Amino acid sequence: KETAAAKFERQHMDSSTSSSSNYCNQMMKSRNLTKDRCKPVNTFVHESLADVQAVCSQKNVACKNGQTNCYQSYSTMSITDCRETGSSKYPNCAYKTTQANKHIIVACEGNPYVPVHFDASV
């Protein structure tokens, strides 16, 4: 069985990189996000696990749903936004790769306190 922390890593972590217009389509599948349906939008953080995990001890901010356990990062991080195009229909999911440098906001919980949800990027 997969955990909240392990799922976040699976869905939003890609430290191996730091790309091409192929990225999203290739990543969204190899991460099993297009399994039972094409996920409308996702985000991959090209930073180290430690860097992302340290956000849980950074700027405490309100989550988009009202909860109080969200944290925003002091520094901007290298990320990638994947948006589902118009020429996209399951099982053939098409995503628009878009790189950027923005602060990230995540939901943290547990013992140890680690990110279990990616809330937004500002």
Can you walk through the features of this model?
The chain has 122 residues and is α+β, with helices and mostly antiparallel strands. It has three helices and seven strands, in the order ααβαββββββ. The strands form two sheets. It has a four-stranded antiparallel beta sheet. A three-stranded antiparallel beta sheet has the order 1-4-5, with helices on one face.
Please describe the topology of this protein.
Elements (H helix, E strand, L loop, with lengths): L3 H9 L10 H8 L10 E5 L3 H5 L5 E3 L8 E3 L4 E8 L10 E8 L1 E6 L4 E8 L1
Antiparallel strand pairs: 1-4, 2-3, 3-6, 4-5, 6-7
Q: What fraction of the residues are assigned to beta strands by DSSP? A: 25-35%
From the alpha carbons, calculate the radius of gyration and give it in angstroms.
14 Å
- The span between the termini is 32 Å
Main sheet: strand order: 2-3-6-7
User: Which structural class best describes the helix and strand composition?
Assistant: alpha+beta
CATH superfamily label:
Ribonuclease A-like domain
Major beta sheet, specifics? 4 strands, antiparallel
Q: Do you know the CATH topology?
A: P-30 Protein
Query: How would you describe the shape?
Result: globular
> What is the strand tally?
7
How many domain regions?
Answer: 1
* Secondary-structure element order, N to C: HHEHEEEEEE
PDB class: hydrolase
Keywords: RNAse, Secreted
Assembly: monomeric
Entry title: Crystal Structure of Ribonuclease A in 70% Hexanediol
Summed up, what is this model?
With 122 residues, the protein is of the alpha+beta class.
